[PDB]
Amino acid sequence: MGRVADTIARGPSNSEQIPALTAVETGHTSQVDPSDTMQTRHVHNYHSRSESSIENFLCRSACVIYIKYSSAESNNLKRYAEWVINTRQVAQLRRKMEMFTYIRCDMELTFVITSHQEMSTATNSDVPVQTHQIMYVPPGGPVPTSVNDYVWQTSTNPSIFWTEGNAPPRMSIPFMSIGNAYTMFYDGWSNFSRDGIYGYNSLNNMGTIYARHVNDSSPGGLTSTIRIYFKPKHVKAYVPRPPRLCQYKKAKNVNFDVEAVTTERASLVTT
Amino acid sequence: MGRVADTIARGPSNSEQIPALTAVETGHTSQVDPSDTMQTRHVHNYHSRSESSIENFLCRSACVIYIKYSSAESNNLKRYAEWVINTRQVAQLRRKMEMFTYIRCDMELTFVITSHQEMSTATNSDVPVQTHQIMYVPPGGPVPTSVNDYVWQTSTNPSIFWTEGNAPPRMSIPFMSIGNAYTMFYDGWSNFSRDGIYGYNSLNNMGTIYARHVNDSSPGGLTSTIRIYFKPKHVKAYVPRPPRLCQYKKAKNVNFDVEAVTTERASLVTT
Amino acid sequence: MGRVADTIARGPSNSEQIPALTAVETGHTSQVDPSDTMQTRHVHNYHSRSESSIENFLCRSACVIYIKYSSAESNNLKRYAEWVINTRQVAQLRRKMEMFTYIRCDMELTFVITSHQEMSTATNSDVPVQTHQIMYVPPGGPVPTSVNDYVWQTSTNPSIFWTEGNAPPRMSIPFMSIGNAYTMFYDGWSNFSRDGIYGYNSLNNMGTIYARHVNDSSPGGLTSTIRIYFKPKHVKAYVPRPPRLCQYKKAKNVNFDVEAVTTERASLVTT
Amino acid sequence: GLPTMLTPGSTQFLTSDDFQSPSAMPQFDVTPEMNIPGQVRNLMEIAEVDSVVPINNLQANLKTMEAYRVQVRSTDEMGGQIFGFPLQPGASSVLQRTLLGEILNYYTHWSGSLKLTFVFCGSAMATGKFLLAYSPPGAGAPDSRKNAMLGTHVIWDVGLQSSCVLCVPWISQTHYRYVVDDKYTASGFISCWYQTNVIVPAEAQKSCYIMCFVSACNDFSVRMLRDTQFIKQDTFYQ
Amino acid sequence: GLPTMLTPGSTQFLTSDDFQSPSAMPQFDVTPEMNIPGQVRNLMEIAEVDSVVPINNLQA
Amino acid sequence: GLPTMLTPGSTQFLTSDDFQSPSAMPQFDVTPEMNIPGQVRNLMEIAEVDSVVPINNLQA
Amino acid sequence: AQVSTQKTGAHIIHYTNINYYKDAASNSANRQDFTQDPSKFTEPVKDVMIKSLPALN
Amino acid sequence: AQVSTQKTGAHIIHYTNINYYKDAASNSANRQDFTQDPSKFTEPVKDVMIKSLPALN
Amino acid sequence: AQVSTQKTGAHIIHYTNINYYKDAASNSANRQDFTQDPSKFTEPVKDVMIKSLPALN
Amino acid sequence: SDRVRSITLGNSTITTQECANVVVGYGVWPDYLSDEEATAEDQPTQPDVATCRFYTLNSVKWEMQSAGWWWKFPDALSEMGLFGQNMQYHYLGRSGYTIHVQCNASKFHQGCLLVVCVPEAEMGCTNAENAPTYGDLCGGETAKQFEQNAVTGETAVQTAVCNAGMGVGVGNLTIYPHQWINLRTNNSATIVMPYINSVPMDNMFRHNNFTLMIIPFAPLDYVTGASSYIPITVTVAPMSAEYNGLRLAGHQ
């Protein structure tokens, strides 16, 4: 297992060994212990670095979008979802994955689907329990264009059917990428002319998740909302990066606005 | 297991062996590797042909019909379903099985049954949860003619009772056919005079699936709909066929309308 | 196992051993048996001290607060809970833990969440089943300020989602403290100047539990209430204390009002 | 079937769980691994790396490069205190936006020694000594060099070696200190003073610069995740 | 009984699953197999066969 | 799956039960124990200790 | 699986327990530990006092 | 119980399957059979054609 | 079944895990791997620097 | 001493007499692609000593108001030597590097630089609706330079050091392989980068493996009458270059 290094005792010294002096004119950072600048005592130290792994750091579920869709078209919600998969909508899950240049992992998608009735003029409203379909179209497939069409037959597309009141539905998505790891920062362009889309959005192409109410519309109608949650598993993350300092602007770019390094102080010397 | 062939290195050659020349005046297609037209290098190749089996190709569930029936007769829906089993209603599941001449398989029928309330003048409407019956009448049995009659006693007929809100009900249907495989194309006629029905519809005779609301009608009434899903299992498919080029016309015939081989190009030479 | 001491027979005695006399001028309490002041008989005694352990005493669940929150703001209930964790709200669970100076234990938090509809002018009210979120913010995290904001994304915070009608949700909280035991009485002050907060409330800093309705508000609105229940486990309690004699006043102090030692009697001699 | 019952919490979704769940593409052949350099396996392989510390964060230096360097200079008296800030990484303004402050602000506990490595960016004919110091809490910051040397301290002498490491020790009455500022578990003060003076020849500059780096030692650990509060949004980015 | 709980996704119908499900005709005697020529076991036994390519697809 | 049924009392919360329940912080490193004097293991280690009795409890 | 004796009452009697979780704080509570040591609240004295002898010689 | 290898990906890995029903048509689908034989749609010729030789002598 | 040690806290403690699925991407996440190698972000230098010696000779 | 090094690659050599070690980025020394991590099924040309050898990029003046510089690779070697003639005839390529920044100064000068190789440095843009045009990322052999204060253009790269043109704290560029050229110790920095990408080889023109950045962290300062021009010269030598998938000239 993993545990912190023990502190080891030393007496006073008065030798020609200098641990304290170093030159940080090299990438080599100092390796000094607190057993090299003062005497210390033997402390058998039982602390574990067990929550600072990259499979405890990244391995908690986090929301990545919500899509709303309606059974009567409440106010520009259509009757089906649609959402081109990326991790860039949020600033939570996104930030932790932009702290590494490359990550390979196996997600678990968990959906949390809830509904609420609309304002409507319908009276004597009783609806049976809703069933929702969540279909995943890998890129280049056919895309639905209406609530009912042939695309929702799910002839080979992965699809989840779920009825309200049951536990949130989840599934695992294996590591699926052209690369040998997902790329979180791409410095290239789509074209060889250095034209078109620039950045990580060039490589992003993970398909689209649609969803709809299976049930034919009731008179009152409802508005459902689906919240997608990704939880990495089996994570190997290569090449670390300084975490973001700036608020994001866009989900396809890194554009940023210039921001302060740190919060103010009164002066150099502050208690 | 199954894995792709490795590429094997070769140096330049200048011999009297011609792998490249062949005669396609025979059914024998060329067996040339890319190691026979240029030098290549040794590539140990780990790709698997594991999703291109016929028990991964055909072994995903696909819709094959929906039947609607009502608890008050909404608009010519009767009070029970009826549907003579075939795989020819759709163009999804149908196409993949008309890519083989003969298939033997054990289905899993999964039903997804949903309901919605009708437009009605009934007020103070509260309905208990519905129970639906799905009865399978093998061919030559007695057929129901009303919502309540003696045929729905299911004295020996397979039948599923299911109450809304529970998981979709499923069952397995073993390989049941007169033949030693299902026949997807029959070139014969029903009669020996070459008269009557022609094509695969002659051999088709798989019984009929009926369904109804078990519950006696409530004042508001409902319209339920049942979607049948077939998933092959244990599939052995014999004799392959070119997949369809043309849109289907009918579910008992192959009649087709003459259609283009391929989409246009501007010219012979296009970038 | 644990069992009571047996009573052992003795005959009459007339010796220079005095078990009965003692001096309680020492902390040493008398160890006399009833076999030292009268003859007794041998009684093999099978009673067990098995319900007077500290893991049977403290190991039953007990309510520690209820918080109310609303889906429409009934009457100053906001739309989310909030409650800074402590065990001092009640007088039940509190008293049993103020009978020991230090306790280390692993809780089980069980929530019992119920709802009732508000008085409202809404008509034709039908609500889908509610889903409630209970988020735990360890101290120093970001705190929600509205029903919907970024804090409820639960990017790393523990959180429970639960839908009404299911069994009460529970979880275990390991022993989490800076100390090597929880402190139930602190005689110090927060500052080194002996200023600021005094008492056990100085050390208390266990984070905050928020909760809300996941569902967007319906027209009628509801008022939900959550009751938190703590059950110790794996309890080691050090240093006992006399139990409280006085009613509590405050949940951050021990302030008390002077109260009678015992209930009245008529006289010294009462039958 | 097997007669079973459902214990409390059983249709819940807990974000910190790990359970098995059926694959959404059965028999999927994942792309082979390759050795991409620099695999991270723990975040004490990022928090043990030096990071420049903005010890001159005033209010006009925050969007310039002046943040990261504090001017030390020849004086005609003795010179006072170059800088000083309360230690408490991930809640001190100075230390919370470095790599031992944006990797501690995903945690709410931290422990173990850290170390500050100073570097002198003066000329090669400039020389001087400085008394680096750390004073455990319970007296406030030292207000003179006399009180500053009662704490743990390291006299740095600028020579060919350009850097000297004040390795703060642990010293705490708890095994972990909160990441957030809490008066209970204050973490002491860092201060730096002129031991001597910067003495430099006529034809070289009288102003030099000291920069500070911060990294954790090999006894450092953290516990218990929380989301960072340095990032925020109002709505989804699109 | 045995105390068990239901993990997320448990009344779902996933089209790509394979689970066991009770037969709808118990003890059914399936028709014997015979060797019908040309069994396909993989679709790289159809995709490795020559097919004429319409390389003069214009518009007429 | 395994065919099981739910016996009476199975969504109940009983306060005197003990069942296992999933941790809310996985892999949490609890603080080490130390020997704090005077561990109580039973409440007949408090009820076997002398306590002054108010045998002159009148009303004043 | 750990097989342990039940609480039996005085004049089979086994139960099986399997731990399913990866934390030891998720285990069901101990209730089978009946260990005691009264003599440190009850007899905290430095020098042993024998019952049959007078306390103060 | 039958214990079989999972689909593993390239550079534990077992799963247990128990059949609960009395029909063999109730068993979960095969997906671990990757057997092939291309040479009967690909090389159906009566007399073997060697690649390196001309097809028509 | 694989039997593995739980996360234990410092001064039984086993758990049993059985994998039920045919894909290895359906297995529960690793959290028991605590392996490290700091010295390649921390000491990336070509020639070893000994702590007790001056860095620049 | 330990202040002296010599590096010989090809027919070039570069020597130093004030040096602080060599930083091997991520502790992996560049080497040819293995046959277990290959993916391209044709013989790779490996020119060896015709492409692995020090190339010198244009020198930049270090002023006392300079805010830094950056060169994206391998777009700064697109015109250099026979390295640049094997990116135009191949669809793929991979190659480590051994960037050597050098910048001598007297013992009466003072100043400090941070030489850092940032894999996958994706630059911002002044307008948040646009992504920067090609000419504003790359200058070829000529460095594009940071500005002290925030700039406003349209398709211009957002250049402010304090964000490093990436929106990350500039002091936190240190997990990336780096050395410091401080003018009272060393006067050279050597960073041997391996090939870092998520695919085994990738098209040289389209994609930029890493971006060198040189950022003054203490301004150049000197007493007047001393030298007023001190240049910073960056040489870089490909290591273990191999290219594959030959095709016609160009990059259209």
Residue numbers in the entry:
A (entry chain A), B (entry chain A), C (entry chain A): 2 to 272
D (entry chain C): 1 to 238
E (entry chain C), F (entry chain C): 1 to 60
G (entry chain D), H (entry chain D), I (entry chain D): 2 to 12, 23 to 68
J (entry chain B): 10 to 261
Question: Which passages does the manuscript contain on this structure?
Answer:
The protomers assemble to form the ∼30 nm wide icosahedral shell with a pseudo T = 3 arrangement that encapsidates the linear single-stranded RNA genome. The arrangement occurs because of the similar structures of VP1, VP2, and VP3, which all adopt an eight-stranded, antiparallel β-barrel fold despite having low sequence homology. Recently, we discovered a second druggable pocket at a conserved VP1–VP3 interprotomer interface in the viral capsid. Here, in an effort to better understand the druggable features of the interprotomer pocket, we have analyzed high-resolution structures of two medically important enteroviruses, coxsackieviruses B3 and B4, complexed with interprotomer-targeting compounds CP17 and CP48, respectively.
